[PDB]
Amino acid sequence: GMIQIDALPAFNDNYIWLLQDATSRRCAVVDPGDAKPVEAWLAAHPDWRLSDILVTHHHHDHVGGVAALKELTGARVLGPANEKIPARDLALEDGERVEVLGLVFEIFHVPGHTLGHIAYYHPAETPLLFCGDTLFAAGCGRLFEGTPAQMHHSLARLAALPANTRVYCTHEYTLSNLRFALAVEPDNAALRERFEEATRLRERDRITLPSEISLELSTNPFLRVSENSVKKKADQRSGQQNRTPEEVFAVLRAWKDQF
Ligand SMILES: [Cl-]
Ligand SMILES: [Zn+2]
Ligand SMILES: [Zn+2]
């Protein structure tokens, strides 16, 4: 019943989240862009079985080790539909539900970073959210394929999730994400507090994830495009009139793209 969730470091700033049912000794992984950290953990736990592989989007740092892990473990590969996903067994659509290690996960189609990006949401007293590269700790992904209108709508869906929902994004972008946020709201007391907190964690080389939606709603600039201060600094940066929250968002993402 109890599910331990641990990050396996990979590449420069990637985290391969490893979901663990230590009673049945079955484990799952999210976005294994490098199969080697997973193979090492499985070798160190030979009586365990990797049962499920969960993919968010088709990018190399998330599927690089999926094919080799399936041929090694036979795990079921869950992936987004309408994207090429190596060795994918189940193509996931918006609104569908899956059961991984006994936990039911809702599938949210979240366009923006990529056109077919999905997210895994588990409802409980403390919900869990695996959103890949869509929502980051005090940030969001770059618009490699989607439009700002798509990405804003996607983040708006995730922001409506319960306040204590745990955000398991992929990358260790928090310190850089907070530095940009200070340029949007230098007078945000909560954001200033969070920046000093993440500065200590990264100085000790400790993880900054998972985050909570409530903390994101109060410090993440891309989730605060309706705020008066953010909308005012948005017009300041572009020198225009951002009439809609989507336009406020489009300026912020283009601003961080060159920040
Ligand atoms: Cl970014
Ligand atoms: Zn990506
Ligand atoms: Zn990525």
From Swiss-Prot:
Pathway, per record: Secondary metabolite metabolism; methylglyoxal degradation; (R)-lactate from methylglyoxal: step 2/2
A Pfam family annotated for this UniProt entry: HAGH_C
Positions with a binding annotation for Zn(2+) 1: H57, H59, H113, D133
InterPro entries per record: Clx_II_MBL, Glyoxalase_II_hydrolase, HAGH_C, Hydroxyacylglutathione_Hdrlase, Metallo-B-lactamas, RibonucZ/Hydroxyglut_hydro
Cofactor binding remark: Binds 2 Zn(2+) ions per subunit.
The organism's place on the tree of life at top rank: Bacteria
Keywords, sorted A to Z: Hydrolase, Metal-binding, Zinc
EC number of this enzyme: 3.1.2.6
Cofactor list: Zn(2+)
Disulfide bonds: none
SUPFAM superfamilies with a match to the protein in the record: Metallo-hydrolase/oxidoreductase
SMART domains reported in the protein's UniProt record: Lactamase_B
GO biological process: methylglyoxal catabolic process to D-lactate via S-lactoyl-glutathione
Subunit and interaction comment: Monomer.
PANTHER family: HYDROXYACYLGLUTATHIONE HYDROLASE, HYDROXYACYLGLUTATHIONE HYDROLASE GLOB
Family from the record: Belongs to the metallo-beta-lactamase superfamily. Glyoxalase II family.
Function: Thiolesterase that catalyzes the hydrolysis of S-D-lactoyl-glutathione to form glutathione and D-lactic acid.
The protein's name in its UniProt record: Hydroxyacylglutathione hydrolase
Gene behind this protein: gloB
